[PDB]
Amino acid sequence: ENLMQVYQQARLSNPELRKSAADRDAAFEKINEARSPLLPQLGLGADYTYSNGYRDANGINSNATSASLQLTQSIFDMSKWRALTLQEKAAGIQDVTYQTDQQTLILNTATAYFNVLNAIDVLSYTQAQKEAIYRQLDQTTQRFNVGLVAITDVQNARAQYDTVLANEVTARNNLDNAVEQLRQITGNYYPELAALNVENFKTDKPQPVNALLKEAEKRNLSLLQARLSQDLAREQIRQAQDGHLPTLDLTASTGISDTSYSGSKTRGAAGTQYDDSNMGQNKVGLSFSLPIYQGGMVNSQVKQAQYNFVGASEQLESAHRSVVQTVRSSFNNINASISSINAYKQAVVSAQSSLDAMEAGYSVGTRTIVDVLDATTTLYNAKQELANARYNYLINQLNIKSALGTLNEQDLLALNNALSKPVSTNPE
Amino acid sequence: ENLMQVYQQARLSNPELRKSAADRDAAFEKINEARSPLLPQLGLGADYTYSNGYRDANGINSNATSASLQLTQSIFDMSKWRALTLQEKAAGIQDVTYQTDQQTLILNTATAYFNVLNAIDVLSYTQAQKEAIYRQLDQTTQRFNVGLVAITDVQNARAQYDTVLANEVTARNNLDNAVEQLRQITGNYYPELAALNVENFKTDKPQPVNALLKEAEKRNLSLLQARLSQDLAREQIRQAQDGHLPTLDLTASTGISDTSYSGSKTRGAAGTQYDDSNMGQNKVGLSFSLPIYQGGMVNSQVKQAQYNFVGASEQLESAHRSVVQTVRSSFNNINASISSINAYKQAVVSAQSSLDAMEAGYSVGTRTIVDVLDATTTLYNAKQELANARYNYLINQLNIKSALGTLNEQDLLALNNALSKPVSTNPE
Amino acid sequence: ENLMQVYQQARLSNPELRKSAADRDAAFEKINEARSPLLPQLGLGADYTYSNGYRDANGINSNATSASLQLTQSIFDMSKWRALTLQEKAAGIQDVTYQTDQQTLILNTATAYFNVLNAIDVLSYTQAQKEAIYRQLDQTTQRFNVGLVAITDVQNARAQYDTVLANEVTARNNLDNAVEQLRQITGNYYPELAALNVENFKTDKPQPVNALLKEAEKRNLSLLQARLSQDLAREQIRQAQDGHLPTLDLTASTGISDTSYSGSKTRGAAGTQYDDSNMGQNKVGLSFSLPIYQGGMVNSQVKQAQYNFVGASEQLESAHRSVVQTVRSSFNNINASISSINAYKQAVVSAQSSLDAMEAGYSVGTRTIVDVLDATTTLYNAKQELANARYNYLINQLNIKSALGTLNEQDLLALNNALSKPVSTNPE
Amino acid sequence: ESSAAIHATAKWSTAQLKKTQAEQAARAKAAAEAQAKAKANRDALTQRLKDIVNEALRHNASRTPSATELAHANNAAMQAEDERLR
């Protein structure tokens, strides 16, 4: 697979994103729970009661039962309207959370993909260095057996070879760990990935940092979430202040009730008054309430909400300083990776131009072939640094777009066009 | 102490585990609070009231007082049965949390113990390296005074000695701080620990990764906790759905009251309506409820509970991927530690063979002192890598038992059997 | 600016501390909310209803209205006094939380300031190492133009020089990113910072660790917060136990009502039951309540509070072990930084004495430029570690004051006395 | 001697690689820690915005009687009017 195909398998299956999507959908569904207390409430209540009188009420027993339907709706209750507007804002903050979890899956997928390619390259250079050291060790061992070379060069070549074997085990383990990080993100193992097209690769210069700052201040998701969180804290001032207001509810009902009586005091002539009784009632009523004073409670709640809003407005300054530092340090790291790729490219070309002359003249007889062994280390050091610098440029080129908040699938497509030939994640 | 004795102190002493035990015992005791609403609820109320009639009832005054012992028992209310069974599940989730804290104390105790032993060995090799370089500084100073070598060999040996002296101060500080990490876990200082028996130490190959995965996916405590969390979220759907149901409660009461009258309208012939009264009342009654419509509230709560269960099922996929990656990385790191121990075991011998050849090479003048100092420092580095690799194998040998969820003190006994000679945590 | 001036701009503007101040002041205003239920509650209720009888209540209709100003005051309710006392304790815990944020801003400001000064020195020593490595590239190029040496020596000198250019890029990027992190803490860009006066810099021995630890045990803010958290959990036991107590409330009402009747059954001789009324009721009463049995609920709540206090007392033991380890490790790292400053100060003079011999040897032509290069690269490594050790000592001198809990701006004044000449944060 | 430049470059180059590998590991660790802290902060915010509205709805649900509580109060009020006529 290439980076784009790997990302489709991640996007479809990844549980971090899919949990975040479910947690977002729950917050949008809670808008209907938050709406519901403004709508007509309707319930049935019913009762049965036996009763037995004693002490002045002695000799009166009774048996009663009743039921009613009860409608209710608020005509004016701003505390319910505030619970709805707070949920609409809370759902908005949760959608920007989901957009951030969606955008970070792109960056983590690319990071895991390039970590596997970087581990394949580090292993490949370690193996190429091992084979070059082994060829020099063998040739030194032949020249020692012919008596041209002292055993001390064979001992030095063995120490080089034995330590590079321990480095190959380390590089192999790093690759065999990196593919499991890619499995955890994507849900899948890949036998081969599309490699970086280093035969045609080139670096573009970023936009001037003033343009990046002005863009991030429009579209960065962390800054947007901080603005929405300040507005939710401001709405909580109004939700506290509206605790001083009057309240008005409409209520309506249809009820039915039955009663009977028994016991010695209800017997005889008294049974004319303690006769069986039956009733139905329809009714409508407006209930009004106004808190006049509550120990200063609402005035404390308003001051607490004002301090919470001050806290949220300083948390927005914290978010603003954070994104300003993030775009500037990303811009620095792109310019540093561009200029260090250019430096390491010349270091590799000059180390190759050295080694191509060394491996000829010092095999032919100019000096001991241990100088070709030492020249070999400079080249495979420089090739590891150059490869690592290329992957740092590619990762920082996505990182700066995450700092703008613009990072999306079309940026994976742009980097996927810099890939070409497949390479196996599991060498022999 | 040995590793077993250190752990048997830590298990009894450690506050982080004992805090977790208290949270577990609290979550189990809370099952009884969750049960209480299903049991009888019983209380005494009592009252006193003065009343003064004004406008129309003007000059009817009264004083009333009463007391009532009251009982309630729910006959059908599924929300209380859901609240109980949810607390029984929440207590079960807290128990696997406690088992995870109990298991991670073992891994932390072993990690701290091996970090102290590894720091003792790094200091010991740094002191041995310093003394070997000092022997060469002394020998080159004598050769310089006899006139056999230029002063530059003494200057090279001196600069190499002064830099290794600064490394010994650093190695000593690493040991001195590692012992305070062991104190923080165990509560105790130790003057000496049982060191690894490197003469009798040998590596064992792990089980095949398919068998490790097949065992871990039925025992790992993080995955088990995620399964229990999905089952709790499924029970929360039933808690929401049962919000549509009717409800039925039984109630009983034994009341006593007194009432008396005063003021102008209660005098004379009209006083026969008022007089006084002393009524006692027994009452027994059933109260029924059925919510017919609630603005769609319960439908929103059910759909929210379904999205919460979807989120919990993706939390279980997250846990499953995490176990797969943790088992596979632990299996690879075991195989890497086993193979790299056997690489460094050879690299020490070839570095020692190189140093013996290098000091001979310097004695015949075909090498410089800087080659002997490089042969010395590469040997003592290879010894430090070999020693470090053994402790990393022992830590990974516990880490796979943590990934399996089977890690217990019998694994500490198996590792403690590889320890022997006491070595001081605080050398002279 | 110097460190003291930088800290004025940090303390004035920093959003982390200012957000913490708002979260502190909110918890103190919440004491007024927590007190409010102990004070008089006063509310105006009002009502209007129409009613229509049916089924033996047929032909009876009524219109009724009421207004009632009513008051409530608790005479005895211990749970309200507990809720107030718990909020006063919670505000005290929040005040030491703010005091910890106020203290950690000092440590972060100094750490960021010394990270910029350290990056200026690392860049300066990298540029000095570049200037030395350039002399090899010059000498090999001149000797190649003379025809005295082969092109290989120029190719290796280029490979080394192009690699020290990649190190200058890395050092310059680290300086830029250090300045951006200082600007995040302080809100400000600085063109120049006051540098360390290394010609008069002086290491000073700390107090003995027993005296440090005996002070920290009285004084450390995290240990104080753990003591206050244990005392809060102990008050929560009393708040649970007092759930068994009786309750007594006073209430009063100035009620007004009006009522009328209509329909065929309200007329005729029965009309005395259905006459118009305007009655008011001026009333005052006491209401008492005592729970007798609650399904064991309060006993479960008391045992849960006892387990929560056990948990809080183990968090106090964990906090105590944490300050013991933090004080001891701070004392270790002060003694180690003092000792390693002395070691690297000797290593710099030792490497300088070696370089002065190689530089004279190269100037007369008995030594090679690569002897001078090896002596120079080892010297600038020693100078870099000496500068690094000085800044680590100055940071650890604040770290022990943080472990003591005494860290304040007079410790920045003690550092600011060691600062001197301005250096540019952005060189040529 | 040319060999001395080859030896010096090989040793010094390997030290620059080891420095770069240590920097790369620290860079990766710092980025992973910052991401973990940010994820934990978004989860804490997600729980806070949930609890803010759940508490506002609990308060609104207790500012007044329920439709069941009003139906039971009406069932009592019918019997209280019957006992006014009794």
Author numbering:
A (entry chain B), B (entry chain C), C (entry chain A): 23 to 450
D (entry chain D): 46 to 131
Q: What does the literature reporting this entry say, word for word?
A:
We find that colicin E1 binds stably to TolC, not as a helical hairpin but as a single-pass folded helix with the N-terminus inside the periplasm. When resolved by cryoEM, addition of ColE1-T to TolC breaks the threefold channel symmetry and the additional protein is observed running all the way through the TolC barrel as a single-pass, all-α-helical chain spanning more than 130 Å. The ColE1 T domain inserts into TolC with its amino terminus pointing inwards through the periplasmic iris, and 2D class averages show that the carboxy terminus of the helix continues and projects out into the extracellular space. About 85 of the 190 ColE1-T residues could be modeled to this density (residues 46–131). However, our cryoEM reconstruction of colicin E1 in complex with TolC shows that ColE1-T hinges open at the TolC box to an extended conformation upon binding to TolC (bottom). The acidic patch of colicin E1 near the extracellular aperture contains two arginine residues (R129 and R131) that form hydrogen bond networks with one TolC chain each. In addition, colicin E1 residues T113, A116, N119, and N120 (all part of the TolC box) establish polar interactions with TolC residues G67, D69, S90, and K305 on one TolC chain (light red and light blue) while colicin H117 interacts with TolC F310 on a neighboring TolC chain (light red and light gold). By contrast with the β-barrel of TolC, in the interior of the periplasmic helical barrel of TolC, colicin E1 does not make full contact with the α-helical barrel interior and there is a gap between the two proteins.
TolC forms a large rigid conduit in the outer membrane and periplasm with a water-filled lumen.
